[PDB]
Design an enzyme around this catalytic site. Structure first.
Site, PDB file in Angstrom:
ATOM      1  N   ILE A  17       0.812  -1.211   0.000  1.00 51.96           N
ATOM      2  CA  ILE A  17       0.000   0.000   0.000  1.00 51.96           C
ATOM      3  C   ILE A  17       0.842   1.255   0.000  1.00 51.96           C
ATOM      4  O   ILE A  17       0.288   2.353   0.090  1.00 51.96           O
ATOM      5  CB  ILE A  17      -0.984   0.046   1.185  1.00 51.96           C
ATOM      6  CG1 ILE A  17      -0.227   0.052   2.516  1.00 51.96           C
ATOM      7  CG2 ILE A  17      -1.986  -1.108   1.107  1.00 51.96           C
ATOM      8  CD1 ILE A  17      -1.126   0.247   3.728  1.00 51.96           C
ATOM      9  N   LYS A  19       5.217   2.887  -0.834  1.00 51.11           N
ATOM     10  CA  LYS A  19       6.661   2.935  -0.669  1.00 51.11           C
ATOM     11  C   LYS A  19       6.915   3.825   0.538  1.00 51.11           C
ATOM     12  O   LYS A  19       6.608   5.021   0.514  1.00 51.11           O
ATOM     13  CB  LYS A  19       7.348   3.473  -1.922  1.00 51.11           C
ATOM     14  N   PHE A  22      12.715   3.732   4.272  1.00 53.90           N
ATOM     15  CA  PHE A  22      13.472   2.537   4.660  1.00 53.90           C
ATOM     16  C   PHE A  22      12.833   1.179   4.366  1.00 53.90           C
ATOM     17  O   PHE A  22      13.469   0.153   4.624  1.00 53.90           O
ATOM     18  CB  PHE A  22      13.866   2.543   6.151  1.00 53.90           C
ATOM     19  CG  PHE A  22      14.127   3.910   6.740  1.00 53.90           C
ATOM     20  CD1 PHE A  22      13.108   4.673   7.281  1.00 53.90           C
ATOM     21  CD2 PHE A  22      15.415   4.415   6.778  1.00 53.90           C
ATOM     22  CE1 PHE A  22      13.357   5.920   7.832  1.00 53.90           C
ATOM     23  CE2 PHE A  22      15.673   5.663   7.326  1.00 53.90           C
ATOM     24  CZ  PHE A  22      14.640   6.414   7.854  1.00 53.90           C
ATOM     25  N   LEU A  89      -5.002   3.504   7.789  1.00 52.52           N
ATOM     26  CA  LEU A  89      -5.926   4.577   7.452  1.00 52.52           C
ATOM     27  C   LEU A  89      -6.389   4.397   6.007  1.00 52.52           C
ATOM     28  O   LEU A  89      -5.631   4.649   5.065  1.00 52.52           O
ATOM     29  CB  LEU A  89      -5.262   5.925   7.711  1.00 52.52           C
ATOM     30  CG  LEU A  89      -4.998   6.044   9.224  1.00 52.52           C
ATOM     31  CD1 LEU A  89      -4.050   7.188   9.539  1.00 52.52           C
ATOM     32  CD2 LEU A  89      -6.320   6.195   9.997  1.00 52.52           C
ATOM     33  N   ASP A 131       8.267  16.838   8.780  1.00 50.80           N
ATOM     34  CA  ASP A 131       7.991  16.503   7.381  1.00 50.80           C
ATOM     35  C   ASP A 131       6.494  16.634   7.069  1.00 50.80           C
ATOM     36  O   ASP A 131       5.851  15.739   6.547  1.00 50.80           O
ATOM     37  CB  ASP A 131       8.526  15.115   7.037  1.00 50.80           C
ATOM     38  CG  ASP A 131       8.756  14.943   5.541  1.00 50.80           C
ATOM     39  OD1 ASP A 131       8.731  15.970   4.806  1.00 50.80           O
ATOM     40  OD2 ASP A 131       8.930  13.793   5.091  1.00 50.80           O
ATOM     41  N   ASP A 149       4.706   9.694   9.379  1.00 48.18           N
ATOM     42  CA  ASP A 149       6.022   9.864   8.747  1.00 48.18           C
ATOM     43  C   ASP A 149       6.749  11.121   9.228  1.00 48.18           C
ATOM     44  O   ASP A 149       7.060  12.037   8.453  1.00 48.18           O
ATOM     45  CB  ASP A 149       5.895   9.859   7.224  1.00 48.18           C
ATOM     46  CG  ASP A 149       5.534   8.493   6.703  1.00 48.18           C
ATOM     47  OD1 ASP A 149       6.394   7.604   6.824  1.00 48.18           O
ATOM     48  OD2 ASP A 149       4.394   8.287   6.222  1.00 48.18           O
TER      49      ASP A 149
HETATM   50  C1  LIG Z   1      10.897   4.286   9.772  1.00 52.08           C
HETATM   51  C2  LIG Z   1       9.634   4.206  10.571  1.00 52.08           C
HETATM   52  C3  LIG Z   1       9.656   4.140  11.964  1.00 52.08           C
HETATM   53  C4  LIG Z   1       8.461   4.031  12.649  1.00 52.08           C
HETATM   54  C5  LIG Z   1       7.274   3.998  11.940  1.00 52.08           C
HETATM   55  C6  LIG Z   1       7.323   4.069  10.553  1.00 52.08           C
HETATM   56  C7  LIG Z   1       6.094   4.025   9.723  1.00 52.08           C
HETATM   57  C8  LIG Z   1       5.668   5.139   9.006  1.00 52.08           C
HETATM   58  C9  LIG Z   1       4.508   5.104   8.253  1.00 52.08           C
HETATM   59  C10 LIG Z   1       3.742   3.943   8.180  1.00 52.08           C
HETATM   60  C11 LIG Z   1       2.537   3.922   7.317  1.00 52.08           C
HETATM   61  C12 LIG Z   1       1.284   3.815   7.820  1.00 52.08           C
HETATM   62  C13 LIG Z   1       0.126   3.836   6.979  1.00 52.08           C
HETATM   63  C14 LIG Z   1      -1.207   3.719   7.385  1.00 52.08           C
HETATM   64  N1  LIG Z   1      -2.231   3.717   6.526  1.00 52.08           N
HETATM   65  C15 LIG Z   1      -1.917   3.854   5.228  1.00 52.08           C
HETATM   66  N2  LIG Z   1      -2.942   3.839   4.355  1.00 52.08           N
HETATM   67  C16 LIG Z   1      -2.774   3.947   2.916  1.00 52.08           C
HETATM   68  C17 LIG Z   1      -3.989   3.425   2.186  1.00 52.08           C
HETATM   69  C18 LIG Z   1      -3.859   3.562   0.683  1.00 52.08           C
HETATM   70  N3  LIG Z   1      -4.931   2.883  -0.058  1.00 52.08           N
HETATM   71  C19 LIG Z   1      -4.560   2.704  -1.465  1.00 52.08           C
HETATM   72  C20 LIG Z   1      -5.683   2.034  -2.215  1.00 52.08           C
HETATM   73  O1  LIG Z   1      -6.888   2.781  -2.125  1.00 52.08           O
HETATM   74  C21 LIG Z   1      -7.262   2.928  -0.762  1.00 52.08           C
HETATM   75  C22 LIG Z   1      -6.191   3.634   0.025  1.00 52.08           C
HETATM   76  N4  LIG Z   1      -0.687   3.986   4.705  1.00 52.08           N
HETATM   77  C23 LIG Z   1       0.320   3.968   5.583  1.00 52.08           C
HETATM   78  N5  LIG Z   1       1.607   4.062   5.079  1.00 52.08           N
HETATM   79  C24 LIG Z   1       1.821   4.161   3.631  1.00 52.08           C
HETATM   80  C25 LIG Z   1       1.626   5.572   3.114  1.00 52.08           C
HETATM   81  C26 LIG Z   1       2.765   6.484   3.581  1.00 52.08           C
HETATM   82  C27 LIG Z   1       2.561   7.930   3.198  1.00 52.08           C
HETATM   83  N6  LIG Z   1       3.725   8.762   3.575  1.00 52.08           N
HETATM   84  C28 LIG Z   1       2.737   4.042   5.877  1.00 52.08           C
HETATM   85  O2  LIG Z   1       3.842   4.129   5.361  1.00 52.08           O
HETATM   86  C29 LIG Z   1       4.184   2.823   8.881  1.00 52.08           C
HETATM   87 CL1  LIG Z   1       3.301   1.333   8.799  1.00 52.08          CL
HETATM   88  C30 LIG Z   1       5.336   2.857   9.643  1.00 52.08           C
HETATM   89  N7  LIG Z   1       8.483   4.175   9.873  1.00 52.08           N
END
Ligand SMILES: Cc1cccc(-c2ccc(-c3cc4cnc(NCCCN5CCOCC5)nc4n(CCCCN)c3=O)c(Cl)c2)n1
Length: 267
Positions: A17, A19, A22, A89, A131, A149
């Site tokens: 879902i 990039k 890291f 989310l 950010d 993020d």
């Molecule tokens: C290095 C480090 C240390 C500690 C923690 C993290 C860390 C950072 C971010 C996340 C993360 C959470 C997250 C939640 N919900 C969603 N929904 C997208 C739904 C899309 N659908 C597409 C299809 O149509 C319906 C909607 N996306 C999330 N995303 C991806 C998006 C990032 C945007 N910048 C995350 O990357 C996590 Cl898990 C951990 N990182």
């Protein structure tokens, strides 16, 4: 981080879902509750120089407890892989939700208001997000707006004092909010057509960006307030929550489900 439990027994990993920083991020299922989660998997063999940055963001997330900050559920180490579990989310990012077409000023004001509530929380906790941008603002399937993020403690959203490596504080987030307001209104930040290394000298060199186009004067003034070169001339998040653009145009977050639906029907 939990070193005994096997995250592959605790969670079902589903489709990618995002990039992430890291590592790649997957939709997942918590097998005990059947709730959907977001799972970032980082290979620690292949991302060794950045491990302390990862730890720092986990620490900051674990200290946050706000409706406006994406929830952190824990992390697990399996062989060389770090699994990080966060709140899923389902509305996607604000950047995603720009794809079908322009936002209206009620949608812009509502999203900015909720971002401001998250910044008010973080700044009151002596934290800086670092950010703020539409890609890092996530919506639930109900229209709730949350921050994700955090930046480490691409230049387009960076305040000039951050680039000049001056001592900065929470007002850097207010500048980034101003850039994010332009991005929500126009689809892209200022200088988006330019090479990043040129943007690195333009942000300190140039007068601050302004919002160009047929937008309400209160929205242009909201942007101008955030985008002052001098950090002490920028308002606080508390003050901006009372800005006339917010008060006149923001509405219930539940209305943002209409925005999420338009993105689903567009695809
Ligand atoms: C290095 C480090 C240390 C500690 C923690 C993290 C860390 C950072 C971010 C996340 C993360 C959470 C997250 C939640 N919900 C969603 N929904 C997208 C739904 C899309 N659908 C597409 C299809 O149509 C319906 C909607 N996306 C999330 N995303 C991806 C998006 C990032 C945007 N910048 C995350 O990357 C996590 Cl898990 C951990 N990182």
């Amino acid at each position: 981080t939990n070193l005994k439990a096997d995250p592959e027994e605790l969670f079902t990993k589903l489709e990618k879902i995002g990039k992430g920083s890291f590592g790649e991020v997957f939709k997942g299922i918590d097998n005990r509750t059947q709730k959907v989660v977001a799972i970032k998997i980082i290979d620690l063999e292949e991302a060794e120089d950045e491990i302390e940055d990862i730890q720092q963001e986990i620490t900051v997330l674990s200290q946050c407890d706000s409706p406006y900050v994406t929830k952190y559920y824990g992390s697990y180490l399996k062989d060389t892989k770090l699994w990080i579990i966060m709140e899923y989310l389902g509305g996607g990012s604000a950047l995603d939700l720009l794809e079908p077409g322009p936002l209206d000023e009620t949608q812009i004001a509502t999203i900015l208001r909720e971002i401001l509530k998250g910044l008010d929380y973080l700044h009151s906790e002596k934290k800086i997000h670092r950010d703020i941008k539409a890609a890092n603002v996530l919506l639930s399937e109900h229209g709730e707006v949350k921050l994700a993020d955090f930046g480490v403690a691409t230049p387009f959203w960076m305040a000039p004092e951050v680039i000049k490596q001056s001592a900065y504080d929470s007002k850097a987030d207010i500048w980034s909010l101003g850039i994010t307001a332009i991005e929500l209104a126009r689809g892209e930040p200022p200088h988006s057509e330019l090479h990043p290394m040129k943007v690195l000298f333009l942000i300190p060199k140039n007068n601050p960006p302004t919002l160009e186009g047929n937008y309400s004067k209160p929205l242009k003034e909201f942007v101008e307030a955030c985008l002052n070169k001098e950090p002490s001339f920028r308002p606080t998040a508390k003050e901006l929550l009372k800005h006339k653009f917010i008060l006149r145009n923001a509405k219930k977050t539940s209305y943002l489900t209409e925005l999420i639906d338009a993105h689903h029907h567009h695809h």
